[PDB]
Amino acid sequence: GTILIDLSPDDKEFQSVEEEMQSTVREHRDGGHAGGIFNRYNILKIQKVCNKKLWERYTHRRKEVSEENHNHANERMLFHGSPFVNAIIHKGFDERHAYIGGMFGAGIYFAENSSKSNQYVYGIGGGTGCPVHKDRSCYICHRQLLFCRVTLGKSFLQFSAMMAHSPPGHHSVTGRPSVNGLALAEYVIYRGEQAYPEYLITYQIMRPE
Ligand SMILES: CC(C)(C)c1ccc(-c2nc3ccccc3c(=O)[nH]2)cc1
């Protein structure tokens, strides 16, 4: 049921998504081990992901959450990187896309920092890097990320020193780095229907000059 619609680079929509990508790159405490060494991306393509069934699944859950949270969906646009990006855009998020060993519990994780999600494109810890070169810092191979609509509802705030159920009375967890003041938040949901993979971004990381 999914169709992908290319956005033109001359479109404000493309430009806004690229700006959110580029402006949320940060340095990581692993010195680039997982995601590579880079300060910016080369954006190759941005596609809108259209699936009526997955969209209706998402809005039905958003409505349930919104009503449970006194008419506040607390909806965000957040990044998600995963080796299962192809499966997600076709079948939606589900328990197979959860990070069982994540710090904030076994759920599906999303990032405000695009570079945080970039660390998971090739798997946990960057896996073995790109298929072709086995390089986690590969500047040649094409990567893909999702920029997703995520319903947080009542979110449990967990400060961090950097499929399960939600904390009782909560629909998500907000993981907020308390040591690195330039690190943005990470968010966890425990139901696949609380996210919709709205944009598919194809890119390369760029070698710093
Ligand atoms: C275990 C699998 C391979 C299914 C998996 C594990 C973790 C992520 C994942 N971690 C994240 C952790 C924090 C913030 C964003 C992300 C993110 O963007 N992605 C994706 C897939």
Ligand SMILES: [Zn+2]
């Ligand atoms: Zn490569």
